[PDB]
């Protein structure tokens, strides 16, 4: 809504992008590991031995 945007909320976004992006990376790696996603995991040195 119009309550969002504005000056203040943009700095909040700036301070929370690092943590949110790293949480997204956490989720991506968790999905890859749990589902044993071949596509991503055929290029990581050690665990290529699974297949």
């Amino acid at each position: 809504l119009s309550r969002f945007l504005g000056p203040r909320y943009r700095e909040l976004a700036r301070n929370w992008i690092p943590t949110a992006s790293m949480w997204g990376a956490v989720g991506a790696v968790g999905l890859v590991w749990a589902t044993d996603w071949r596509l991503i995991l055929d290029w990581v040195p050690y665990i290529n031995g699974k297949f």
């Binding site: 119009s2 309550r3 945007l5 504005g6 000056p7 203040r8 909320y9």
Partner: protein
């Protein structure tokens, strides 16, 4: 004129048939709830009794007699100033928030 369609819609809405004023049908959100809290005692009591009469009528599926209908020209907007002030204050708080 446009008032013709406005009056037609006022009659078609049917809340006047229950002896209700326009602002009596307002959905009670947060700003509106604060608005009713802000109301003076006499207006609040009148509004409460009017709503009780409307609920009583709808329970029996009956409407007020023809003559006791809130005429479109006599629908005082008692809540409108208080609700406008509450919304303006909320807008001020939101603007200070950004």
């Amino acid at each position: 004129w446009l008032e013709g369609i406005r009056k037609w819609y006022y009659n078609a809405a049917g809340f006047n048939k229950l002896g209700l004023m326009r602002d009596d049908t307002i959905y009670e959100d947060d700003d509106v709830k604060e608005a009713i809290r802000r109301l003076p005692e006499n207006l609040y009591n009148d509004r409460v009794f009017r709503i009780k009469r409307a609920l009583d009528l709808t329970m029996r599926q009956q409407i007020l007699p023809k003559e006791q209908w809130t005429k479109y020209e006599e629908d005082k907007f008692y809540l409108e100033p208080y609700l406008k002030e509450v919304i303006r204050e909320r807008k001020e708080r939101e603007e200070w928030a950004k």
